């Protein structure tokens with residue numbers, strides 16, 4: 328009975344994903360959690 | 376000749392530092408015989424600001440120069456950070 332209360336349904340999702348581009352000056356940082364997972368965060372850049 | 380001046384002052388040759396505040400160009404139109412296309416392509420284009428002017432009979436342009444000295448501009452030293460090469464904090 329203690330097992331069914333302390334059982335998690337998932338492991339942690341918390342991804343401090345920062346993107347540095349040489350075309351810009353600021354780092355583009357997103358944090359992806361469990362509730363906001365499966366959500367694409369598109370960042371478009373016309374420079375290659 | 377204008378594009379040669381901006382290349383010499385390092386304006387537009389970078390993506391992180393445009394340096395547009397280091398060259399301003401103002402063109403004034405004197406007569407009714409005025410090509411508004413040629414005077415617009417020479418003047419600078421900065422944000423929320425005008426640099427092209429068209430007036431007639433000359434004497435009214437002399438009227439704008441005595442009027443501007445009656446106009447007092449509230450100078451604001453707040454929020455000014457100019458890029459000095461001694462970039463320690465509190466600068």
Ligand SMILES: *[C@@H]1O[C@H](CO)[C@@H](O[C@@H]2O[C@H](CO)[C@@H](O[C@@H]3O[C@H](CO)[C@@H](O)[C@H](O[C@H]4O[C@H](CO)[C@@H](O)[C@H](O)[C@@H]4O)[C@@H]3O)[C@H](O)[C@H]2NC(C)=O)[C@H](O)[C@H]1NC(C)=O
Nearest residue numbers: 347352384385389391392393394457458459460461462463
């Ligand atoms: C006027 O023009 C001159 C010539 O372009 C310009 O000189 C530049 O000065 C800056 C510093 O103000 C230099 O930047 C640094 O230079 C050192 C070597 O001296 C490098 O090691 C540095 O790289 C590291 O440091 C950075 C942070 O400081 C880090 O972000 C980086 O990842 C590295 O760890 C850094 O590049 C620059 O090299 C010179 N350029 C030249 C061509 O000499 C001067 O600053 C201009 N004046 C003004 C007010 O802008």
